[PDB]
DNA sequence: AGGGCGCCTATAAAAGGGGGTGGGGGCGCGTTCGTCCTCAGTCGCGATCGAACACTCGAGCCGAGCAGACGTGCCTACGG
């Protein structure tokens, strides 16, 4: 082997999970067509239902802005100020080698 | 040239010194042994240095609670 394997909650382990939300979220962005762009917080839910929503919390709110409306189905729209990082930023962030 | 004479052989004893020869003792020298010194190596003791552990402080993360906002249902008051 020439990659190092994490142990379980190790700082490597628990610093790869938070980087690995923060580009499936990014990446929710880019997939949304809304201007300006929003998201909900039951996808990524879906896709991380180990996660708590107060974890999820804190990796959206440097980004988005919580709009609420009248219905349980609601919107992280994206904000103004933000500049939304590009594709090869995303992909600086988490190599194939680290998941 | 040859008879008689001188000398050799043998026997005792002494006396004294001199010379010759063999053995022993004494002296001087060299050799051998013992002791001491020096060098090397090893072990023991002390001191110093490095490593490992434990304690303390701080920072970060997670959970829980409270507050705000909107939906919905119910009750009341207002307008037709």
């Known amino acids: 082997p020439l990659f190092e394997v994490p142990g379980p909650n190790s700082k490597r382990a628990n610093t790869?999970?938070?980087?690995?939300?923060?580009?499936?979220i990014y990446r929710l962005f880019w997939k949304s067509?809304?201007?300006?762009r929003?998201?909900?917080m039951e996808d990524i839910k879906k896709a991380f239902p180990s996660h708590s929503e107060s974890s999820i919390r804190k990796r959206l709110?440097?980004?988005?802005?919580?709009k609420r409306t009248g219905m349980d189905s609601n919107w992280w729209v994206?904000?103004?100020?933000?500049?939304?990082?590009?594709?090869?930023?995303?992909?600086?962030?988490?190599?194939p080698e680290q998941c």
Do not use: G
């Open 38 to 40: 929003r998201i909900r």
């Open 78 to 95: 994206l904000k103004s100020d933000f500049r939304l990082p590009t594709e090869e930023e995303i992909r600086a962030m988490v190599s």
């Open 16 to 24: 790869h999970i938070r980087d690995f939300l923060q580009v499936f």
């Open 61 to 66: 709110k440097l980004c988005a802005d919580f």
């Open 33 to 36: 067509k809304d201007r300006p």
